[model samples]
Target chain A: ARKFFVGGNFKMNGSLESMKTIIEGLNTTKLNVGDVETVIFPQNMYLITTRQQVKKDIGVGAQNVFDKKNGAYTGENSAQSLIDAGITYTLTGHSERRTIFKESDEFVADKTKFALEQGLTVVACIGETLAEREANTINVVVRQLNAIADKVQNWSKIVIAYEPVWAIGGKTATPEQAQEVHAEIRKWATNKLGASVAEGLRVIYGGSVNGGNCKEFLKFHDIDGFLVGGASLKPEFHNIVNVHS
Target chain B: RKFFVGGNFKMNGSLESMKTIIEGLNTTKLNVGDVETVIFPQNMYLITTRQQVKKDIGVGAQNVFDKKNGAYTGENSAQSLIDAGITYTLTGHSERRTIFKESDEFVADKTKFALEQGLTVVACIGETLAEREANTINVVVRQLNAIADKVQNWSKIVIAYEPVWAIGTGKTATPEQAQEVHAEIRKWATNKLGASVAEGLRVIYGGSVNGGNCKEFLKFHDIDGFLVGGASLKPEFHNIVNVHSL
Candidate 1:
């Protein structure tokens, strides 16, 4: 069975002091993550201190990483630098980057491939927007996955985050609707990479994830975990962590 | 007038290498003339770098977002930089312009917000090889003028001219060519912001600056100092720092 996974995307939020408080709370909380994998992603600026202070059991990830190992790309953090700083996981191709930053699917794949080559575990995020979903273009997500699969052969170090654009802010998608896509993603994997890798792959759901709704999604066999956003900043995140229990 | 030198470490170096660079700066006994020195490292290492580096040298960030704070994911703000003990920020490098599609107005807006937030600004502007070949130095002038239009005060700003063709390409503009552009930049400053603010301004040169040829550029009337690129990663950065002494 695929291990359960939960990732908190702090995004471009929090100050150093605030981050310390969040990590401190996690360190002292009575979390029941016996079979679940947990990772917290902070802004690139706070990764060092967070890695040093956060609980060792909980992994720390960078919100984004550049395609190159290092050099001349101002304002970008390298995967090598992330590894040196003890950061082992990173999120690539998040919806915010796809929509706000104009990062093409192919560029995101290049970054994912580069980070994987540098021995970093990647949480590769993919999903469709409101218009695309309305237009029944879930194929867009498949095309995105195909872009990465075309470039990178290895899928063992990746966790796919399926975040729909319309459901991101405060909007919610029905459990059946989300499960439909998750099921389709699993089938895609089975067809593309053979059944063994497909059965073992962890496909998590994002977009409007919170404690109140976490348990409902956990019922779906294919929905392995969540990539928590705004709710990750609050104490209720522990509730999501213990949802399966 | 005090000369200024800055090192744009630019998305390079591991933790060990960064620590070594800081230790080298800490141990060097270069002449402390009327000069101000700052170093720019990637955002990931700024806090630790500030804590370890000696008090004499200042640490800055290579880029910052326009907003002070909000939902702009994957971007850092000037306020956060200041809170991290960073007092300076570099905006509008050619790489950010061409690769990231950051326009002059966006760079100027970021610079204006950074200065308004009480951080120093190293406002970078330059002409590409085509612009230089076309004899349109006014493009660089207009780039500087865009910032001047947004910001009224020039006290906290230093202009860095990095020719796009020369950076990372093992090419260096003849000192005369660099000085011509630097002179035009100063003349524009004198015309727009007045002689007093203009006289206090420092126009530095970048692109393939190393210890070997730093002295020649330092000798120019308007070329005040440098924003060293590759050479800043080595101990020879100390030599570049003491080029005026040489």
Candidate 2:
């Protein structure tokens, strides 16, 4: 069985003390570590502190990282530095980044390749915007995956986050909608990379994951887990974490 | 007359490397008695570097979000910097302008918010390589004026004149070229914000500034100090810090 994975993306939210509280809550809670692989992407400022705070096997990740290892890329965190700080995971090409920062597919791919090479696990995010999804242009996501696949040799160091742009704003994908896309991804991997790699890959669903709907989506065979956003900041996150347990 | 020198460690150094640099500063005897020294490290290293560095040397963030809080994910806020014990921040950096697409108004808003939250700002302004080729020195003035339009108080602001073409390229503005921009910025401030505030404001130079050329740059009439970049990560930082004494 693919290990159940859950990632918390505390996207540009929370203060120092509030972040500590959330981590401290996680520390005190008993998680199903035997079956679950967990990671948390705090804002970069809290990466080191949050890493030190969590007592469980839960990994810490940065919301973003630079393409280069280091030097002159102001306001960017290097993968080498994240590794030094004991952070093992990071998210790149989040919809916020693609939409707000105008990061191109090639740029995101370069960052993923660099981060993975420097010994950091990357949760590489890709999704179709509302327009693309409504127009049945979901193949744009396949193109995005190919961009990274072309640059990166190792697939084990990467987790795929399929965050639908429409769902990210507040809506969520129905379990069937989610299963269809996730199954399509598995087929893409199986076709492009082969059966063993596709079966081993953990393709997590993002975009409006919460406790109420999480269990419904968890039943899908292809949906490995979640990359949760707003709900990750709340106590209900514990409910979502225990969904499998 | 307080000479200010800020180290723009700009997107470089790890926790271990930054620790060594700060600890080195802690042990050094460079006479900062007459100078105000600050170092702007990457955002991830800010809290850890601040705690490890000496009290005399201030630690700052290379960039910060304009708002106090909310969902501008991956961006940092000035409020968090204050919480982290960071007293200063750099904004409108040429790298930020060219690479990240931060408009002058957006940078000015950030500067205003950071200042309103009681943090000092090392606001950077400069002309691009193309702008210089086009001889649009007034572009620098326009950049500076954008900030002046939003912020009324100049007391906590240090304007850094970093010519974009000169930064990290090993090509530096001659002391005369640097002085010319510095003088123009000073004159802009005097005419815009009045003489007293402009005179009190610190106008520093960045881009390829190192210990070897620091003294020559400091001798100019309007140049108040240096915003050391590449040299800031090295032992030579001490020499730059003690240039007056040396």
Candidate 3:
């Protein structure tokens, strides 16, 4: 019952002309898979324009948004503004935000729920650091997920993306490693939340995903889709978009 | 010629509402030639705010990172701001310092980097309640010294002295309180940056600045202008900008 979700997180990169080219390519290309859903996470600056240029069923999102509806949280945007700008999705708790910006786990969870309350399909990213992975991966990611699980009541609007921090800017994870984590996520959610929620949750893999390897991961039963990074900025993204088992 | 007022919209307003704010600012026929005006909209609205505002009025980013460009993710680079026609970016607001964990050294590095990229920087500094009660001049001076250590020149920088305790708490520093701090800041500039540079520097006051009491702070000799908070969203921002008319 879970559809595949592919997210292109532009991540503070790209110019207007470059974004125009990418949006046009997405507009012209065929997604082909009816069970696949696509979303692009552009910086707040170009969101409305991306929304306008893209064809229907393609989603536009903000790389980040504040938990509040609106006020003096300088340099932050409200979820209400995202909706007003035609942005339907938002990313919270990426490695960059957790590592570089020093956002706490509870804060990321708060933002996820708040954006969801204001009507956004949130791709909540959870992953363990390089050192933590060496010691124990499940405990770290489970703690990250538990933060959101504690606050959130509904799972319908949420998509859990498991992007291993160690794999984000470097060597891609093997199909087996990806499958192990995706399976663990489904198992945990199935036991913790219930069978209905577990069966419905679309758990995607991120971290160095590209066209060449997406087809390999498609063979795994639990790896639902991708939350792409660098490759999402290139022409090769469409190949990953068209990837099938 | 040294007067400047920056309306920091922060995270407030939708495109529809921000246009109304920008349009209100654009339609003002008052002669503000004596005052330099800029509004720091959220990053998303920088282009729209730039396109909508008058030639004399400038658009700015509420924040910017030290990086020129790359995979920092969810951060705006100073080069991108320049590419988008943004003339200024406010760095090291108390919110960023306290909430975002930006160190004094980091904010200074960011300010210097932004200046190197050909963008004006509104470098912010102030004392917390504990610091102010303990010693006011020391805190502000230390904050300024960090920037001076990294940045040799002060020409393109506007220093906004926003007391951390006063921001968004419904509490405001009185006119006398703000002016006294501004005078001491100028004295620091004179001693450290030479008298000529000190004379040219614009030390603006922020932290709970509003339409009701703007004129009181405007009368002081050393308070060059203001970095307004909530009032920046309303017509009173124009009133504050045009306050020099009286």
Candidate 4:
């Protein structure tokens, strides 16, 4: 069975005191359900303490993982330390880390393989920008998914977060436009992967998923959950989750 | 200038989570009258974290390379850590040793080097599972002794004896396991320096020191303080801080 998952990527934000109130809001709520998996990726500084404070059900994820197990690769978190410290997942192939940090697609693949091999659930993010979409290279998203599928055989553990490069952060694709791409990706999964594998996959939408638009995106069956960005930092993040509830 | 407790939250927590633990720590009855507290947050949150912590709690970078400054891009330096207002730096943690492949010499170099930069060093040295099974705790001490040999004084040296096998494994050394190495380290301190220096050298034990086991192990003749791991994430961390009294 497919599980609905919502993850908050609080990219480099929050103070110690302010972060506590956000966690208390989540832990003290009846918002959690056995059927849904809610995870949050905060700045590395807060990952450990957040993992300790959240309700046991909510998993913690790191925004990035280094390819090597460990080394003089200073300023990077190791795969074993991330697992040993008890994070539930680690994200790979996010647009920003790839573009800004200069992580190639192959590096993303290795990181995905490493996370799965280390027993961490993997959230593989893929998408293309306005030019790529206009150029009709939607296959860019498929190629991104294919890279991981080729390396990490287990599809069950992979949650594909389809954040269209063009529509991410600023202008969210309209419900119809977003679903068009979501359905195309789902179709690829069903055809390339067997039915059982395809049926259980959770392909979440990510560019600026807000409380207002989350429900419209949810109208598509393939849109199982969300990977919230800026909205994730506010009280309205709960409202995004309630989109499905 | 005295006893210090540094928490390496590593990469497992978020700001919200760190806040809860810190707030719980803020309310802790463990007075800072005689000791100091430091926290090592991951690099991205360093500036924001320094802003959140109370003045009483000092901060340290969990690890830093020997490099002073450059276009090393994406790497933080010992000098930058000091500039960031951090007071201490941990070098050669087992996690860094094994995973980062940091060798004893590299660690020692970083240690003496960071100290020269005027930052205190929580110079960690520990034997791995293979060396321990071979009953070579002294191998670890000699490893540390070599580092001590180069440095001129013991003013800022806080040796943390974290057994490689014990860290992050949820299995702590029985009080015997902790005291044996600590006593040897104390002996080395005295032999290599003098009784005064040995008496002053703070040999802390890391690797899963928790409230359940703290009081007994902490009372060991030479065990001065702790470099706590997972337990540092809880409210009872203050308990470990006060264990010597009870």
Candidate 5:
């Protein structure tokens, strides 16, 4: 059985006092562990401070990371830097980065591959745009997934987050709709990367997921868990964490 | 106007290395007034660095998002930098421009936004090896023109003319060649901005500057100081900042 996973991408949000409060809130809450994995991604500047405050079970990650180890790359958060800062995970290829910064599938794959090599568990995100979904959603995700699969032979340190680009902000997808994509992703991975690797690959759903809706989404077997956003900063994140238990 | 020396560690150095460097600076009291020092560490190390350094030194971030705060995931924000006691930020650093592909207009926008957020800006402008082989003055001028369009108050800006060609590379420019560009920049500031603005503007050099030859560069009228990289990691950074003692 694939273990459930829940991740939060805080994005470019919060001040020191505010982030400390959010970390403290998560620390005080009774979170479900052992069967489920939980991690939160903070802005690059907040990684160390967040890691210092966060509990051991709740891992901290960098919202973005560079493929390189270190050098003259100004403004970049390197994978080595993340490891040294006590960050275990890194959210690569978030739709915002792909859409806003125009990160190519190849570049995202490079980052995922490098982050993995540098001992960071990669939350490798792939998604279809609303237009892509209308035209052909499967093709877009398959191509995105193929980019990573091209470089990365191992899926052990990788978690595939299927965040629909359109649903990320204000829109929500029904459980059935998410399940359809998740099942397809599972089927594709199984065929492309052997049954053993595919079996362990956790294809999680993200995009407008909230506490009220996580229970319904969690019931879908292929939908491993959630990659939450705004709700993560609020008390509702607690409800989502306990949904499994 | 004080001589400015910025240690832009870039994406180099570990947390331990930074602690050692900061601790070195914290204990040593180099001559002040003539020199203003700031170190831009990696984003994750900003808080720890800000807390570690003494009051005489300022802290800065290598890059910051143009927005005050919002949903530009992974981009460090100006407001966040100020909240951590970081008073300055480098805009349009060569590494950001070349590797990250930061456009002139975007860098200008970030500089404007950082200034509006109450942070001083190290507005970096320079020419690549290719650009230098042709019209170097035109290239740096074009870069500065972008920021000048968005910003009005020249006082808060420290111009870091880091020639893209010289940075991190073992190569360097002659003191005379260095002054030629800085003097042109000073001319640009006087002509485009005003005589008064250029008089107060601090045009610092950047690239593999160390204690061994800092004196020669600082002797030039427009080369007010340095935006050091490699040598800044060592205690020898003191000799560079200790120009007044000489």
Candidate 6:
């Protein structure tokens, strides 16, 4: 009975000049998130404008958040910063930050703890690299999830993005691979947190997901939705939204 | 002949504060002979900020999108920004690159998009501590190339060189350090963009620039103005505007 979910990670894109047309399009489009939890994430610079222009029926999210409050940590946006800026949810430990910025699993765990503590829902991302995939350390992902289970008391507010690092911005995950991972993640949630928590969790796939391939992932038993990247930037974004609607 | 300044609010501040700040800048005494001003607030506040802004003080957006019209969601393009009463915009800001993960390509695309829509650009470029320590001063050149490749001419471009390390840290590049970088940037502009283009270009410094360091910074021939941060919030920012005359 879990609802389908779709989130657009606009990443570090948008400025005041460029958002109007896209937002206007979203308002006029027939995409219905009333049955599903739909979120549109703008870069921090355009969050306010994007939120103001987006249909009130839809929700908004931030790309990321730092664990700290106002600090000398230049360039890092704080949890409170995003919360005050009006983000209902935020992602933590995207593969880009994990690989490029070298966010440790513990660091993500801490940020996840911080975001939840602030009453902001989290779409916490967890994934393995090409090497990890080859090494067959899906258990390592479970271990990462276990770390969260250790730190976080509840799973109701979390939207787990099972984003395979290699697949992101490269290839769409096959239905089999997506199901395998999603099932394993749900299994771990079930065993660790019990059936109620696991039953409600939405273990979504992320990567080069588009309207063309998202339906394939949707067929899998545990694939609840998507944390989309490039494909989300297009009009087909509504196509992904209506998959279950 | 004088300093042309713009404050990029960058999705920070509210309409009430933007109005007060613009009003304050309006009422503040400046030797108009030496100062020209603008404010680049968020897009949502543009109408109200513009309504409240004093005459001759321009308004800009923190950034813009490149596509004129497309499926890109939660993004505003330059054409839309122009339509929104925003005459200028900032691109390639350090916060944009580091915190938001925007590549040089996006910066260039946004610049081209802005120019096509008839909006001016305050194209910002800077180096981080790691890049600077590695002696990659050419990164600034690469950043410029990213925009120049898309833009047709130099008429509406203003380059701000902010060292990523010095920003918001209460640290500053000495006058010598600043002049060296400014001179190098000017030299880079003259060589790649040519004399006519380079002469009209304004290369400014940002990153924790305050009234305390404003006067000494104005002495450099290449440092045309400042893209101020913390100092812009304080009342002394007015004083920084006419530091040369003062």
Q: State what share of the real interface contacts each candidate retains.
A: 0.60, 0.64, 0.62, 0.07, 0.79, 0.02
Which ranking of candidates, highest TM-score first?
5, 3, 1, 2, 6, 4
> Which candidate comes out best when scored by TM-score?
5
Q: Candidate 1, fnat value?
A: 0.60
- TM of chain B vs. native, candidate 2: 0.96
Residue pairs in steric clash, candidate 3?
none
lDDT (Cα, tens digit) per residue for candidate 4, span A71-115: 333346666667766887888888876665556777789988988
lDDT of 3 by residue, A87-153 (tens): 8999998888989988889999999999999999999998887788797888888888889998899
Question: Listing every candidate in turn, what is its Cα RMSD in Å to the true structure after a full C-alpha superposition?
Answer: 1.9, 2.0, 1.8, 10.7, 1.4, 5.8
The sequence of per-residue lDDT tens digits that candidate 6 reaches over residues A150-215 is 778877789999877766445656888888889989888888889999999988888667776787
lDDT of each: 0.86, 0.85, 0.86, 0.74, 0.86, 0.74
The DockQ assigned to candidate 2 is 0.64
Per-residue lDDT tens digits for candidate 6, residues B124-188, read 88998888876647888888887877777778888889898988888888877888887888788
Which CAPRI tier for candidate 5? medium
Model 1 interface DockQ: 0.65
Tens-place lDDT per residue, model 2, A1-245, is 78888999887776768888899989887887988888888877777778888974898999988898688877888888888889998899998888988889999999999999999999999888777887663588889889999899889878898887866554656888888889988999998888989999999998677788888897888999999888899998887887865
The DockQ assigned to candidate 3 is: 0.65
Q: What residue runs in model 5 are displaced by over 4 Å at the alpha carbon? A: A168-170
Better of 2 and 3 by lDDT: 3
Cα error, residue A207 of model 2, in Å, equals 1.5
**lDDT sort, best first:** 5, 3, 1, 2, 4, 6
